[PDB]
Amino acid sequence: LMGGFGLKHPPPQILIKNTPVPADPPTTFNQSKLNSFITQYSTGQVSVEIEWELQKENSKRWNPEIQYTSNYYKSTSVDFAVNTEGVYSEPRPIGTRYLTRNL
Amino acid sequence: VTQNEGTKTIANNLTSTIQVFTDSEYQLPYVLGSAHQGCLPPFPADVFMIPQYGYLTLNNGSQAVGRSSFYCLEYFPSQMLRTGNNFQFTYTFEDVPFHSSYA
């Protein structure tokens, strides 16, 4: 209902945590558990190869159907461009139902 | 057919030919199924004429959206056929539940 694809057996969920580094433990014994730790974190590179299938327009629509294109005029900040601050955004949302496929 | 002074005469012109085809890829607006009239004579001995062809697209009443395609079959292959030259083709269905013809 949020559009997209559904699967009876969808790609899994990836879960991670940082190894519990128990801080300095008491010299003498204690029955309780350890709460003290060392604030730490990590980084890394996320790789995700998504293969894709497609069906291209084979229609004989004689007239030039409509396409999607950035407006060909001159604007201050280019679309999907990075504002002079690196922070970039998206000018507008985009759909797929563009190619005029005969019903 | 010549029409000299209301006095018309129907001669034969075998020199001419005709062009016909079939839409397999279903790129043209399927017209039948709308059950338009002018069907094959529900009778055998009587002959008839083939109805012209016209289709429709998306429209905003008296006008049409750009997403209103346009078609011209003469942009397809057509078995150019002259008299004396026959024409045939072949088709096959696919599985469909038998129309439950029972009470």
- Kindly report the number of other CB atoms within 10 A of residue A100's CB atom: 21
- Kindly report the number of other CB atoms within 10 A of residue B95's CB atom: 4
Quote the CA–CA distance of B43 and A42 in Å, as a whole number: 84
Q: Indicate the DSSP class of residue B60.
A: B
What's the one-letter identity of residue B55? Y
What's the one-letter identity of residue A2? M
Q: Residue A22 corresponds to which tokens in the numbers above?
A: 């128990």
Min Cα separation B24/chain A (Å): 12
Please give the sequence-ordered ranges of beta strands (E in DSSP) within B24-88, or none if there are none: 79-82
CB pairs under 8 A between A and B: 29
**Of chain A residues 62-81, which have a CB less than 8 A from chain B?**
62-63, 65-66
Specify which residues A37 forms β-bridges with: A22
SS (H, E, C) chain A: CCCCCCCCCCCCCCCCCCCCCECCCCCCCCCCCCCCECCCCCCCCCCCCCCCCCCCCCCCCCCCCCCCCCCCCCCCCCCCCECCCCCECCCCCCCCCCCCCCC
Quote the CA–CA distance of A75 and A73 in Å, as a whole number: 7
Q: Are B81 and B87 in contact (CB under 8 A)?
A: yes
In chain B, residues with a C-beta closer than 8 Å to the C-beta of A61 are 69-71
Kindly give the pairing relationship between strand B79-82 and strand B17-20. Answer: antiparallel
Quote the CA–CA distance of B27 and A60 in Å, as a whole number: 7
Quote the CA–CA distance of B44 and A4 in Å, as a whole number: 53
Q: Residue B26 corresponds to which tokens in the numbers above?
A: 């279903």
Q: Are B82 and B76 in contact (CB under 8 A)?
A: no
In chain B, residues with a C-beta closer than 8 Å to the C-beta of A58 are 25, 27
Quote the CA–CA distance of B26 and B91 in Å, as a whole number: 14
Look at the block and give the residue holding tokens 């079939």: B22
**Nearest C-alpha neighbor of A17 from the set A47, A1, A37:** A37
- Kindly report the number of other CB atoms within 10 A of residue A52's CB atom: 4
Q: Residue A32 corresponds to which tokens in the numbers above?
A: 């309780």
Look at the block and give the residue holding tokens 């004429």: B49
Q: Are B61 and B55 in contact (CB under 8 A)?
A: no
For residue B15, report the phi and psi dihedrals to the nearest 5 degrees: -60, -25
Min Cα separation B60/chain A (Å): 16
Min Cα separation B71/chain A (Å): 5
Quote the CA–CA distance of B21 and A81 in Å, as a whole number: 50
Experimental method: cryo-EM
Q: Are B29 and B56 in contact (CB under 8 A)?
A: yes
Quote the CA–CA distance of A99 and A59 in Å, as a whole number: 9
Query: Closest partner residue to A60 among B66, B67, B71, by Cβ?
Result: B71
Look at the block and give the residue holding tokens 């730490």: A40
In chain B, residues with a C-beta closer than 8 Å to the C-beta of A102 are 26-29, 69
Residues 6+ apart with CB under 8 A from A38: A21, A23
Q: What's this structure's resolution in Å?
A: 4.8
